[PDB]
Amino acid sequence: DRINTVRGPITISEAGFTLTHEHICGSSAGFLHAWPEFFGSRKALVEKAVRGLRRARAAGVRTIVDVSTFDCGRDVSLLAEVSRAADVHIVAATGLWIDPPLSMRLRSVEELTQFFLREIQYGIEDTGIRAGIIKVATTGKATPFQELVLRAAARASLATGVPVTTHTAASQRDGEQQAAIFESEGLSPSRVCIGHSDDTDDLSYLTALAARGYLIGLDGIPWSAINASASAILGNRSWQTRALLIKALIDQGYMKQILVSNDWTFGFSSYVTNIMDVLDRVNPDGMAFIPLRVIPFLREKGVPQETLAGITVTNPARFLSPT
């Protein structure tokens, strides 16, 4: 009874192979509840999510961390249903993403701290489900509100021991501004993951954050566009280029600071209409891309099996553990 999941508290050993940055549905607050037909139906979305996590479990995955926040349309009741049906542990998230509504964006740091603490200590909505991770975001230079979210995330993390994970515009080196704000609040670097870090080839930026104790979120491995709307989100860099960054950080002695994931989803309303149809053709493996296509690739390049097992099992366990 260490890590909080959508099914209740589980132990460190029960976690196993863990994908640290995933989504069941990328949406907006109240959207799935108000317009389920957008995704065909709520039943069609549940079935697509259950089939996907079952194929991921058959490939080796035992736990996924759903980093969808309130404004990313997190519906913990959906997460609970798909978790139970697929028999895969799902860790829920609190925090705020890139689309906070007026009722969230006009709040103070004290109020946001109360909201984050409520979702971790009491529960999310009326479900009783407690969050086991805090997700925050910046897209370049932090807005005055985003600074308050990062400070509230840090204050909520120090009071509960629950980790913090971030969304970044990696090419603009956001991890450094996020890191500076977290440390100004007294938050330990070992409790933070700088996500979307595989969107850049700047190894100097990655190794420096890793040297301070930060976990590097190399979470968008299958995202490649090799269509203006699809190119702007997937990027023009291959999956191999993103995957070689895992090898590059191991070679420099930072195997303990790596967190790998797919940043996959089954429903996607916070982008263009038929993006889910384009995404499932680029990567038909889905969340099963890390154990099926990325792990045997790194084995062919010379990376040992024990260090890859240390990145997928030991690192997320230490990260998700309340300390």
Ligand X SMILES: CCOP(=O)(O)OCC
How far is Cα 20 from Cα 193, in angstroms, rounded to an integer? 9
**Identity of the residue, 119 or 199, whose beta carbon is nearer to its own copies in the bound complex:** 119
The footprint of its own copies on residues 4-63 (CB under 8 A) is: 27-31, 33-35, 37-38
Q: Is 233 in the site for ligand X (CB under 6 A)?
A: yes
Beta carbon of residue 299, minimum distance to ligand X (angstroms, whole number) = 26
Cα–Cα distances (Å) from 78 to 40, 44, 92, 171, 224, in that order, read 15, 12, 11, 33, 28
Q: Per-residue DSSP letters for 157-173?
A: HHHH---EEEE--GGGT
* Cα 243 from chain centroid (whole Å): 17
Which of 234, 219, 116, 223 is CA-nearest to residue 164?
116
The footprint of Co ion on residues 259-298 (CB under 5 A) is: 263
The footprint of its own copies on residues 73-92 (CB under 8 A) is: 73
Beta carbon of residue 299, minimum distance to Co ion (angstroms, whole number) = 26
Q: Is 167 in the site for ligand X (CB under 6 A)?
A: yes
Kindly write out the interface string for residues 257-296 of this chain, putting x where it contacts its own copies by CB under 8 A and - elsewhere: ------------xxxxx-----------------------
Q: Is 172 in the site for its own copies (CB under 8 A)?
A: no
**Quick one: tokens of 62?**
């035992």
Q: Which of 107, 155, 167, 242 binds Co ion (CB under 5 A)?
A: 167
Largest alpha-carbon pair distance within the chain?
51
Q: Which of 41, 43, 84, 108 binds its own copies (CB under 8 A)?
A: 108
How far is Cα 270 from Cα 137, in angstroms, rounded to an integer? 15
Per partner kind, with CB cut-offs from 5 to 8 A, the member of ligand X, its own copies, Co ion, none near residue 115 is its own copies
Q: Per-residue DSSP letters for 99-119?
A: ---HHHHT--HHHHHHHHHHH
Beta carbon of residue 26, minimum distance to Co ion (angstroms, whole number) = 7
- Where b means 16+ CB within 10 Å and e means fewer, 195-220 reads bbbbbbeeeebbbebbeeebbbbbbb
Each as own residue / partner, the long-range contacts of residues 121-125 (CB below 8 Å, 24 or more positions apart, any chain) are 121/160, 124/74, 124/76, 124/92, 124/94, 125/76
Contact call for residues 27 and 34 (beta carbons, < 8 A): no
Q: Which stretch binds its own copies (CB under 8 A): 10-18, 117-125, 198-206, 208-216?
A: 117-125
Q: Which of 265, 269, 283, 312 binds ligand X (CB under 6 A)?
A: 265
Per partner kind, with CB cut-offs from 5 to 8 A, the member of its own copies, Co ion, ligand X, none near residue 265 is ligand X
Contacts of 296 (CB under 8 A, 6+ apart): none
Per partner kind, with CB cut-offs from 5 to 8 A, the member of its own copies, Co ion, ligand X, none near residue 70 is its own copies
Per partner kind, with CB cut-offs from 5 to 8 A, the member of Co ion, ligand X, its own copies, none near residue 262 is none
Beta carbon of residue 168, minimum distance to its own copies (angstroms, whole number) = 18
Please enumerate, by residue number, every residue annotated as part of a binding site: 21, 23, 135, 167, 196, 263
Residues that bind ligand X (CB under 6 A): 23, 26, 167, 220, 223, 233, 263, 265
